């Protein structure tokens, strides 16, 4: 609240300093931001404690950055951490005390939890609460009565209005409890699903699962994990532990296919007990319990097919023990978020790898599903070898003179097709691919602009893939890339970042970018994170290039596009010039060649 002569807020008169400050490696700002030391001998103990109560926002190598909020604190109580259980240790760990504002905030957040509990039974949602006083003063707003369908006091609530009420209670200072007591539940018989000994659970995976299962009752929340970290395995394990009906929801045809393979590979459950509620193909969804479906079909808004209609009615009627939603970052979408209310589930676990977006709808994920249970440390995984180390880089490609003139001259937005297609980046990518091609490194180019992607591919006569590409040709190209030594590069369009199972690649060039989308960058980055059989963290075998054009709008997006990655700890190095580019022969080595491309670019319209 107090501002120094500079921008920083003043806290000299706010909180004191512990005499043994050096022993205590923890800081506590009044705003809730916390700065831990990654060099302290007791760093690990602090890391576990802070992660339990706070959600990371920046975890560079030396000094991590944690901020706590109401959602973060509620999760701590769910795992059994009381206000004194956390504040006492926080004061002990704090090297500068705890400001009263945080103290009262912690007290208010912890006490305002568990008073209101939401339980669904017999397809009816009852807002149970041991304390009756909470309900008495909770019915002041008229929305509650109209929302409601027309000790331990409970009342049934309308199915459709659950989401509206859930967000209302969050700002009402009375969060709802979504814990599932699968251990004590006889209404829905347990499913015959078991985890085979073959599956191996990594220490972070166990910790993420442990945080989800704070007590005998499973907690509904979001577990963010890298795609190469094996987030699919964790989802399977959670379903196996619940031992009740689970409805995994994908986002595309590829997503549903992989999940079924993951279930069979890691779960002993029989093949016949798994169904694919997919329009393209089905396996008698009503017949068995464990099902894999997609947001589009379940949330499909237009006319429903007769066969789908029966399945949809069957899904609505039944009650699901678990509702795994992979790629939760798309949930707050209008159609996608409707699926939450359409189906009934006790705890709706959420998995993903890039929990970031521009529109401030990510915060809704806290109430749409639950608090962010776990968010693995990408840097720590790199040290442990679970994830391939990446030498993130940003190759600056100076714009050719003529190209800039039209780019600056025109105030229209043809520039997206212009600065994405310039000779220097073309030579840069052409040179960059050539260097990696002779190094036996697998390349995965990317480009939002299909027009640029096709032009780059034909000139480099490489197997470019994109949306309307035939499925058969899509598989044929991938198989050659994985197997054929003669080919070690595939030019994938945006479809690559959506969902796929691609072979591990040593490098990932990105000539163009869709825009300032932290999702796409992290989505595309996860492709090379696939750990190799016998690599090492320090070898930096995996690389990532995000080619950009200097003095162009592309730079603004690139800096705005790397915010999420740097927060994890990745350092994006800049490369003004590439050694050996001049000696190596490359296309567009003469003014005429650039002129024809510019004319074609201008003729694009």
């Amino acid at each position: 609240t107090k501002v120094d002569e500079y921008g920083a807020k003043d806290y000299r008169l706010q909180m004191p300093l512990k005499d043994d400050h050096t022993s205590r490696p923890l800081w506590v700002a009044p705003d809730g931001h916390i700065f831990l030391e990654a060099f302290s001998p007791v760093y690990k103990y602090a890391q576990d404690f802070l992660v339990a109560i706070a959600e990371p926002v920046c975890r560079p190598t030396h000094v991590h950055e944690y901020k706590l909020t109401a959602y973060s604190l509620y999760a701590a109580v769910s795992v059994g951490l009381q206000t004194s259980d956390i504040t006492e240790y926080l004061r002990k760990l704090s090297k500068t005390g705890v400001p009263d504002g945080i103290m009262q905030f912690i007290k208010l957040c912890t006490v305002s939890y568990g008073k209101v509990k939401l339980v669904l039974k017999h397809n009816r949602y009852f807002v149970e609460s041991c304390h009756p006083d909470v309900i008495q003063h909770l019915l002041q707003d008229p929305v509650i009565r109209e929302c409601r369908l027309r000790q331990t006091v409970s009342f049934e609530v309308k199915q459709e209005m659950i989401e509206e009420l859930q967000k209302r209670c969050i700002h009402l200072e009375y969060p709802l409890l979504a814990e599932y007591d699968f251990r004590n539940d006889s209404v829905n018989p347990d499913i015959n699903i078991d985890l085979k000994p073959t599956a191996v659970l990594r220490p972070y995976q166990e910790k993420s699962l442990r945080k989800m299962f704070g007590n005998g009752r499973a907690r509904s929340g979001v577990i963010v994990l890298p795609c190469g970290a094996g987030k699919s395995l964790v989802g399977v394990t959670a379903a196996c532990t619940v031992r009740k009906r689970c409805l995994v929801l994908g986002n595309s045809a590829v997503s549903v296919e992989q999940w079924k393979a993951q279930f069979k590979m890691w779960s002993t459950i029989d093949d016949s007990q798994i169904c694919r509620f997919t329009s393209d193909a089905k396996d008698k969804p009503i017949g068995c319990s464990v099902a894999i479906s997609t947001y589009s079909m379940l949330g499909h808004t237009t006319k429903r097919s007769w066969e789908a209609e029966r399945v949809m009615e069957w899904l609505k009627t039944q009650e699901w023990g678990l509702m795994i939603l992979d790629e939760v970052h798309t949930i707050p979408a209008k159609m996608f978020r409707r699926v939450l209310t359409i189906v009934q589930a006790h705890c709706k676990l959420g998995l993903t790898a890039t929990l970031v977006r521009e529109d401030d709808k990510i915060v809704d994920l806290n109430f749409l599903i639950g608090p962010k249970l776990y968010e693995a440390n990408w840097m720590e995984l790199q040290n442990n070898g679970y994830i391939a180390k990446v030498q993130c880089a940003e190759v600056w490609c100076p714009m050719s003179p003529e190209f800039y003139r039209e780019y600056v001259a025109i105030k229209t937005k043809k520039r997206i097709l212009l600065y994405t297609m310039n000779p220097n980046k073309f030579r840069a990518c052409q040179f960059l691919i050539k260097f990696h091609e002779r190094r036996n490194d697998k390349i995965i180019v990317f480009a939002d602009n299909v027009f640029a992607l096709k032009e780059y591919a034909i000139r480099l006569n490489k197997p470019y893939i994109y949306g309307p590409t035939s499925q058969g040709e899509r598989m044929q190209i991938l198989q050659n890339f994985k197997h054929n030594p003669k080919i070690n590069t595939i030019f994938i369009s945006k479809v690559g970042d959506t969902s796929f199972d691609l072979p591990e690649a040593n490098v990932l060039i990105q000539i163009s970018s869709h825009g300032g989308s932290r999702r796409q960058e992290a989505q595309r980055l996860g492709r090379v994170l696939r750990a190799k059989k016998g690599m090492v963290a320090e070898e930096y075998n995996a690389f990532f290039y995000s080619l950009v054009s200097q003095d162009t709008q592309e730079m603004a997006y690139s800096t705005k596009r790397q915010r999420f990655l740097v927060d994890q700890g990745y350092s994006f190095k800049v490369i003004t010039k590439l050694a050996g580019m001049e000696e190596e022969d490359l296309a567009f080595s003469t003014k005429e060649e650039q002129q024809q491309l510019l004319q074609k670019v201008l003729a694009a319209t």
Binding site: A393, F435, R439, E539, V574, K577
Partner: peptide, 15 residues
């Protein structure tokens, strides 16, 4: 063998 490229090993900025 399998050594890192020059433009990644050291800064390529003119400084």
């Amino acid at each position: 063998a399998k050594e890192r490229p020059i433009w990644l090993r050291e800064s390529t900025v003119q400084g």
